[PDB]
Design an enzyme around this catalytic site. Structure first.
Site, PDB file in Angstrom:
ATOM      1  N   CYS A   1       0.834  -1.255  -0.010  1.00  0.00           N
ATOM      2  CA  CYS A   1      -0.024  -0.035  -0.027  1.00  0.00           C
ATOM      3  C   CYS A   1       1.083   1.386   0.000  1.00  0.00           C
ATOM      4  CB  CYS A   1      -1.008   0.128   1.290  1.00  0.00           C
ATOM      5  SG  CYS A   1      -1.386  -1.898   1.887  1.00  0.00           S
TER       6      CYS A   1
ATOM      7  N   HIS B   1      -9.250   3.261  -2.502  1.00  0.00           N
ATOM      8  CA  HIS B   1      -7.764   2.818  -2.214  1.00  0.00           C
ATOM      9  C   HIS B   1      -7.287   1.915  -3.475  1.00  0.00           C
ATOM     10  CE1 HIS B   1      -4.443   1.823  -0.127  1.00  0.00           C
ATOM     11  NE2 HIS B   1      -4.950   0.934   0.892  1.00  0.00           N
TER      12      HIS B   1
ATOM     13  N   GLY C   1       0.491  -3.437   4.203  1.00  0.00           N
ATOM     14  CA  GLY C   1       0.853  -4.670   4.722  1.00  0.00           C
ATOM     15  C   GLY C   1       2.137  -5.137   4.627  1.00  0.00           C
TER      16      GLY C   1
HETATM   17 CL   LIG Z   1       6.906  -4.065   5.386  1.00  0.00          CL
END
Ligand SMILES: [Cl-]
Ligand SMILES: [Cl-]
Ligand SMILES: [Cl-]
Ligand SMILES: [Cl-]
Ligand SMILES: [Rb+]
Ligand SMILES: [Rb+]
Ligand SMILES: [Rb+]
Ligand SMILES: [Rb+]
Ligand SMILES: [Rb+]
Ligand SMILES: [Rb+]
Ligand SMILES: [Rb+]
Ligand SMILES: [Rb+]
Ligand SMILES: [Rb+]
Ligand SMILES: [Rb+]
Ligand SMILES: [Rb+]
Ligand SMILES: [Rb+]
Ligand SMILES: [Rb+]
Lengths: 395, 395, 398, 394
Positions: B91, B351, B383
């Site tokens: 992300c 997102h 993540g």
């Molecule tokens: Cl990470």
């Protein structure tokens, strides 16, 4: 380069390179990458794994590998959860660009200890079903081979890299015979280096749980040379008049390679013995179907960045995506083969694409030591039109 | 500070499309090309042919083809000479891309860099993992690439939503607190939409008719708020006692965003009007299942890198991977909500995981301008345990 | 009832060898196997041309990716006239015997005089299914469905495998892991003994697999019988219930490839072209009960067929009770009071193999051989099928 | 003389559009629905009186074990019932009824249900090579409808191309086929409007667990647009092709079933018969010329029944394509005023496993409404075959 903080290579390590669906095919790419990272760090007297602050790891065909392959490599190698981890994809140059980004991160003062490299498990690349979400009402459909789609097919021409190799043979006038004799020579050099123990230091053997245990010690491809079959086989991409074959191309392969980079201040703080110093680097790019000769732009650029003349390089690693790629870049740059890939190249050793950029750097350090050279340069072309190059001084 | 200056001379993003929604017909490179081309058209006196290097984030790269970042660049009309690297820090990919772009200027290897990220979650495929060796007998699984490569922590094999629940338990946030946050950030996005505050940063997308053309102008998700339904919906991950829902979490989305970066020398050379200055950045990581509060480490690190106090910041973008993520980092850092995501966040905007790091930065610049601020900070968890943060000064 | 209808005569039969799963015959499709058995069975009939065949009933269960009308493909592949009526039959495991029944009926209503009937199955070439690609599945892992499991081996109602209902049969009728293991060993030895004695040579039509320009590979034997290893058999973990199961893979039937065909002619065409009948169909019986009780469905179909034939169970010389598992042979022998010394005398599907669409014809082809070898006149073949049913047929050797 | 066979009732589902109003239903659910509806129509016949079932189904992949067994049990039939699935491609539904009538005629049953079902919406795709694997290269997912329904085996060509053959073979233009398609669409919409399908159609309830839904109409006939139909491009040969999606039959979902009884059972239970089966005929020729196989089977069925062609009050000739009805009418010399009086597959739909029973069901409603006595139904099938049957209404 000039007046920026120096970057030292304090170790390097690689897995053996496995053949497609072969000796290493039971391991995932993070498993191979973790193994190389762990083996690189074990070689540095006075540096702990917990000293590693950041990881850049190349990987191209990342489908089904899971979140952030580099982060999985790093944690699987036993690094701390505080470690910054980024996965890099510049296709075949991913492993070398990773090392460049690692050196830059030391140079800008954001890390003192960086592990960089690359990994690829081509054996475990999946097939894709692209249109299951919105459906396809009627008609046959395709399962896309992930290796072809994300590794080996030029996006604009939708042609496989072997057809770009054929462009290269046409563009620079290399025949089937010239390509075959080059490939035989590079197999012979790889076998000679193998038999003489010259890969023993760089390679970290892999133990496979058992039957009893299996140990993978050697690269799988070099033994496969059969010169009679090589000269007799049919061309692989253009029937009849083709020049590129599976023997004189690089194979599909599994493996990983890593280097440990430290700043000058950290070298002195921990009283570390450096193996080599990074002098410079360069990336370049041209028309995508001509990626084969992009190293002829990246290599001079890295040499200028490093402040080093081409004639002073004692050994080159020009990645052998195909035999014709080495031949064409040697011709364009005026580099004699006597200074190129002295322990063999990817045509005979293998080409796990996200790892090859770091793999040739590891081999180059061995070549410089074995041949008593000081300055080396690694150059690797990549699908899409690019190339990356790096200059090191063995200390 | 004692590092060469890096200027943002422009930025742009696509509208953010819903999963299988308004932009599902566009591939990730088509989205990224659109963002890149839009951002460059804004810089008076700089040509697309001036761009030297591209870093572009992309997480679920399966079936996108060779080097997503290279496809974005060529698609936007950049020169075949452009150096292009795809970046995956889940992300945070889009923000780490910008960081690497700034470093490439700081080490002097480029003077003009485009960086950002792109994601087409609509076009993420399913995988068939075992067709190369085959499976003799039994039902076989088709892996959803979003779950595998975007949303599941590799270590635990647990969805990020479950680790969001761990965050709500760890830091004491109820269903109601998260829902009331969600409603506020939807109302802030709707207010920004209706007031035209996204008009500058968004480059509308014209979809050619195969039938009438379709222009996509606005983010698809903000209009979906139904406060009655949001409060009554079942939990999404833990039955009965769960506090995380689809309405109070980020959706799955399509979009891209890009920034244009130049050196001090090139700014003066071309007489370019700078929008902002990058003052510093920071990456941090901790235990993977605690990725939700990694920004509480990255943000202070970026502020210290920038030589700026937390109190000096006029506006923050804390990426709303989940409502509980914004609540928890606001609690740990002592940042009042009236300084956070002033035009709404990803819970309401969407997102596209590879683009969000650059998307929030684009939005941040719009918030600083609209609210007449000077100093801004973007922070985004990812993540695996990581976060990235960046500090900018509006000029 | 049978005497009021025309007589039906079997004038030949033929079967391919039975290949193992992904084994000796896995390069052939079910219509290639079926065409091979039809062609071999017609070449045995002196005085009858392949162009005299009017209609074909052929069994096949897992027909996915086989193409339009497997029976037609078997008939054309065998050199039959394009004017031939062809219908594919699916009564799961009984399909090959039910095709033969429908062939007999088609002669008896006067609608044909020369009929080829049997079945075929290539379990090796059964595909996997992608069930939801037309409408899509927006989010989530999805499933590639094994066609053998879905359309061949799973009860539709309970959605449970047949092996689990073979276990149900074992608890129902009291047959231990030991009793199934030792019966399995016996039918393997009966099959091996028949193999060594050459008692399959007549019925089997060896298959020639082409070479790459280079002699040809020839599959002459059934592939499964040689695999008997009594040590591993008694020692292997159960297949469907860990720890307390009785049904194992060695004492169950395998997945297999193969085909079998018989040739049927009316009493008129027999005397007309002067043919030598091998056997006469005396009657048949289908029956069915609870789907999970299919294992004991032959105990209904076998008496019904004997009654249709006007023959007594004690008058039957040999029985072919198809061994879907060892326990179904044990159970039906117990329910019917039939001793094993009259049952599957050259072995059964546990040892020979179970190409499900072909097996109903396969056991009839072996039944005629058993009667010739063992000097018998009356045979009964009975075969259960997934779903609760069974089919049985009664033959008199001439 | 073999026992006579009586149709005591018949029912059919509404015919659904591809991925349409019935796509939530599986072929056994559609089939079970039609069986229980035909059984409900007979007074004094209990569902437990049915002894055997023959049901047609072509694309059986992923339907589960023995579609016909699933149809029987889903319909409420006794577990003692004997069930067989039959595939003669497009003729499957009619061949099953022929097989069911023979099972009564040899004395093995007194009550048989026969018919056919198809859920083309729920036909899967196939991955053919996962067991042995494929090491390197793109792979195919095969469309089960193309492979197992619509492609001739030897020619490897879609049925649309066989229909372009039939057009060049017997001389019917794109205009001659489109006018027929319009006529059948109008014939179909007039029957709906006149209630002439309501007896035979058993509606289905799709309940909400959400609003409830009831499909009562066939989905295809309302879609006729003569301006759009005249102006579409050809579907199988560019420029010169004469066959199109409007003038062809569609992919559809549906089921039809008939209840058959012996002479003795009709008398024992005092049942009132709808019709009597007089004879049938199966024929076949060159596979790519299957379109004109009815021109063989229809006479053979009239022959076997001992009736002549000029004695039939109504024909149901299955409209695999508009050209197919036109070619067979030319060869048998049948006037279209005597053909498919309530419309045909081009307008109504073509769930291939079911259409052989669907057109017989509709034939009996035609014969009742037109006050007819002798009907004939013939249907071609991929592979080169055709089946035909002659009924007399009582
Ligand atoms: Cl990470
Ligand atoms: Cl490139
Ligand atoms: Cl059954
Ligand atoms: Cl046919
Ligand atoms: Rb160490
Ligand atoms: Rb040291
Ligand atoms: Rb070593
Ligand atoms: Rb090679
Ligand atoms: Rb510009
Ligand atoms: Rb704009
Ligand atoms: Rb949301
Ligand atoms: Rb013969
Ligand atoms: Rb033989
Ligand atoms: Rb066995
Ligand atoms: Rb009734
Ligand atoms: Rb009705
Ligand atoms: Rb139509």
């Amino acid at each position: 380069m000039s007046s920026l903080p120096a970057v030292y290579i304090v170790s390097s390590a690689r897995t053996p390179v496995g053949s497609f669906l072969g000796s290493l095919s039971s391991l995932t790419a993070p498993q191979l990458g973790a193994h190389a990272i762990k083996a690189a760090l074990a070689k540095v007297d006075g540096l702990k794994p917990s000293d590693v602050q950041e990881v850049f790891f190349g990987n191209v065909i990342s489908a089904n590998v899971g979140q952030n392959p580099a982060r999985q490599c790093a944690l699987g190698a036993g690094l701390e959860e505080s470690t910054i981890c980024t996965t890099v994809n510049k296709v075949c140059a991913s492993g070398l660009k990773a090392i460049i980004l690692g050196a830059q991160t030391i140079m800008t003062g954001n890390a003192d200890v960086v592990v960089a490299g690359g990994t690829e498990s081509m054996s475990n690349a999946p097939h894709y079903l692209p249109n299951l979400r919105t459906g396809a009402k009627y008609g046959h459909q395709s399962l896309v081979d992930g290796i072809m789609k994300d590794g080996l097919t030029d996006a604009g021409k939708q042609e496989l890299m072997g057809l770009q190799a054929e462009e290269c043979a046409q563009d620079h006038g290399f025949s089937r015979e010239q390509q075959d004799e080059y490939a035989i020579r590079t197999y012979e050099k790889a076998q000679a280096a193998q038999k003489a123990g010259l890969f023993d230091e760089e390679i970290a053997p892999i133990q496979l749980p058992g039957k009893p245990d299996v140990t993978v010690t050697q690269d799988e491809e070099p033994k496969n040379l059969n010169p009679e079959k090589l000269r007799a086989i049919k061309p692989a991409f253009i029937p009849g008049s083709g020049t590129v074959t599976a023997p004189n191309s690089s194979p599909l392969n599994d493996g990983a390679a890593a280097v440990v980079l430290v700043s000058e201040a950290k070298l002195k703080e921990l009283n570390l013995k450096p193996v080599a110093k990074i002098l410079g680097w360069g990336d370049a790019a041209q028309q995508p179907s001509k990626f084969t000769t992009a190293p002829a732009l990246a290599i001079p650029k890295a040499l200028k960045h490093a402040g080093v003349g081409q004639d002073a390089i004692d050994a080159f690693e020009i990645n052998e995506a195909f035999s014709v790629v080495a031949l064409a870049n040697m011709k364009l740059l005026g580099i004699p083969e006597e200074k190129v890939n002295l322990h063999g190249g990817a045509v005979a050793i293998g080409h796990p694409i996200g790892a090859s950029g770091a793999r040739i750097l590891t081999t180059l350090l061995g070549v410089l030591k074995a041949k008593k050279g000081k300055l080396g340069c690694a150059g690797i072309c990549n699908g899409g039109g690019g190339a990356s190059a790096l200059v090191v001084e063995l200390l």
